[PDB]
Amino acid sequence: LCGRVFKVGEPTYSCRDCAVDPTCVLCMECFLGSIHRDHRYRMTTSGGGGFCDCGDTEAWKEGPYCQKHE
Ligand SMILES: [Zn+2]
Ligand SMILES: [Zn+2]
Ligand SMILES: [Zn+2]
């Protein structure tokens, strides 16, 4: 229920422990309210476009939702 579309220069966060593949990402809001802030995460700046995968159970091996969207 996030669905945020990233803007130019916006940080995106993946979790190296939980992402199903390297394109699985969270926006800043969802990352900071998720279990993955305590994991090995990777921040990549968006060039614009793409979207947050919070809530997609097929994107995450654990912790698919943040506290705001669960
Ligand atoms: Zn989000
Ligand atoms: Zn969320
Ligand atoms: Zn994780």
DSSP string of 39-70, one letter each residue: S-EEEEE-SS--B--TT-TTTBSS--S-TTT-
Indicate the DSSP class of residue 5.
B
**Bridge partners, residue 15, by sequence:** 41
Task: Identify the experimental approach.
Answer: X-ray
Nearest by Cα to 42 from 23, 63, 57, 55: 23
- Cα(1) to ligand 1 centroid in Å equals 8
Resolution in A: 1.1
52 annotated to a ligand binding site:
yes
Instruction: Give the number of the ligand closest to the Cα of residue 51.
Output: 1
Instruction: State the amino acid at position 12 in one-letter form.
Output: T
Q: Ligand 2 mean position to 63 CA, how many Å? A: 10
Q: How far is CA 20 from the centre of its chain?
A: 11
d(CA 20, CA 39): 14
CA distances from 21 to 7, 39, 67 (A): 22, 16, 22
